[PDB]
């Protein structure tokens, strides 16, 4: 019942992570990193509150959480940035506009993906409900392996899909449009995956992940 | 309008399918794969040019899409011909590799395991020959965001192929909840193809095709 469309969205709403203040006393990169580390703590809490997540094997939970974290941080960036073109509201005291991304090399490229991708969610007029579901789906779909308890993950993923389908339906739009809007939302996930990979490759070319693994062993 | 109709579209995409590519071999594994990709890229341009309306986008957008997608489209094609043989990757008619052979070159084993995992997830869903044709089209049309944010034309094209996929799934005869689930299941896979595409690109750029593609793209432009 807790996975029923209306209940599942309300459950996902309450599970939303709190505002994260980095509290600043290389640096842009220090701030971004200090934030990710803080956000990852709350992301674990969040996933635990998704009905049925905790009941997957700890193997799968860790597996999903290790491969999605970047996407899920990005999806959350996009969503709070959605109403302000040219900017990226990372946190309540860390708003960066595109050009501030020229400082650090390779980052301007990524900012432009996030901004482009945000722009597209603004064009589709992404709804608060739809976003709640999409984010859940990013986590549940983040790794293929734990799917090829697998029974359980498949059923969970279908659950959130149905909820998204349900959300779109009470939109009152025709059935052709319902399918199109489902398809348009899901194709954007390819682009969030994309920006996630760019940020990861870049993150590793730098001179959080270990801190995450610590949290994961703690989990 | 009508040439983009669900039925005509799928048949058109069918005929547009690239020919078999014989690599014809007289570091080496990576030499083969690279010579193959280069050959495949030629035919991929032809293939896109046969997708109704592709040619009637601005040249700028055609080039944007082709440069962004070529790896995913090549991988999508790999997965599809490999789909019935677990543990293997039929790259071409004279280049079948199995998981283990991926240990030779470093970094490649990780990629093979994504490709093989993704292929298994398409074998479990029982991907249909026409579902595949539509999906591949969508990978190209969805490969770049920028040309969408002629943009009118790309959106229309992208809706067309989607409708075709929905249509294909519909005559599947399954219920409506299942039709949605299967649309959703196919599309979430695209994230994983994107993903493997990115790992291959990164790995390719670390090595000592892309320039040869830009040459092809300039010739497509002239
Ligand atoms: C702690 O990780 C820091 C970091 C290092 C890096 O090399 C790349 C990235 C990094 O942070 C990522 C990030 C995304 C969302 C969010 O809420 C917090 C952090 C993105 C931000 C970025 F600048 F767009 C690139 C990518
Ligand atoms: C010409 O590019 C050669 C290459 C270099 C590299 O660094 C990485 C890759 C490469 O080839 C890619 C490829 C994918 C499909 C296809 O039909 C032909 C080639 C994949 C094959 C791979 F080995 F799985 C990794 C990735």
Curated annotation (Swiss-Prot), chain A:
Coiled coil: none annotated. Changing residue 153 to R: Found in a patient with a 46,XY disorder of sex development; uncertain significance; shows a higher positive regulation of DNA-binding transcription factor activity. Residues 4-219 form the NR LBD domain. It is found in: Nucleus. Belongs to the nuclear hormone receptor family. NR3 subfamily. Nuclear hormone receptor. Binds estrogens with an affinity similar to that of ESR1/ER-alpha, and activates expression of reporter genes containing estrogen response elements (ERE) in an estrogen-dependent manner. Binds DNA as a homodimer. Can form a heterodimer with ESR1. Interacts with NCOA1, NCOA3, NCOA5 and NCOA6 coactivators, leading to a strong increase of transcription of target genes. Interacts with UBE1C. Interacts with AKAP13. Interacts with DNTTIP2. Interacts with isoform 4 of TXNRD1. Interacts with CCDC62 in the presence of estradiol/E2; this interaction seems to enhance the transcription of target genes, including cyclin-D1/CCND1 AP-1 promoter. Interacts with DNAAF4. Interacts with PRMT2. Interacts with CCAR2 (via N-terminus) in a ligand-independent manner. Composed of three domains: a modulating N-terminal domain, a DNA-binding domain and a C-terminal ligand-binding domain. It is linked to Ovarian dysgenesis 8: An autosomal dominant form of ovarian dysgenesis, a disorder characterized by lack of spontaneous pubertal development, primary amenorrhea, uterine hypoplasia, and hypergonadotropic hypogonadism as a result of streak gonads. This is Estrogen receptor beta. The gene is ESR2.
């Amino acid at each position: 019942d807790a996975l029923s469309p209306e209940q599942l969205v309300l459950t996902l709403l309450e599970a939303e992570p709190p505002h994260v203040l980095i509290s600043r006393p290389a640096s842009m990169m220090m701030s971004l990193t200090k934030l990710a580390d803080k956000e990852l703590v709350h992301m674990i809490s969040w996933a635990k509150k998704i009905p049925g997540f905790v009941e997957l094997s700890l193997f799968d939970q860790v597996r999903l959480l290790e491969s999605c974290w970047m996407e899920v941080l990005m999806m959350g960036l996009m969503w709070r940035s959605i109403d302000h073109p040219g900017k990226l509201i990372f946190a309540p005291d860390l708003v960066l506009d595109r050009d501030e991304g020229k400082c650090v090399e390779g980052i301007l490229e990524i900012f432009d993906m996030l901004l482009a991708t945000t722009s597209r969610f603004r064009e589709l007029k992404l709804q608060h409900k739809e976003y709640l579901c999409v984010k859940a789906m990013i986590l549940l779909n983040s790794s293929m392996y734990p799917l090829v308890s697998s029974r359980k993950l498949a059923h969970l993923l279908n659950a959130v899909t149905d909820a998204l389908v349900w959300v779109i339906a009470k939109s009152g739009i025709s059935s052709q449009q319902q399918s199109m809007r489902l398809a348009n939302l899901l194709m954007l996930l390819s682009h969030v995956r994309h920006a996630s990979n760019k940020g990861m490759e870049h993150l590793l070319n730098m001179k959080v992940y270990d801190l995450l693994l610590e949290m994961l062993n703690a989990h």
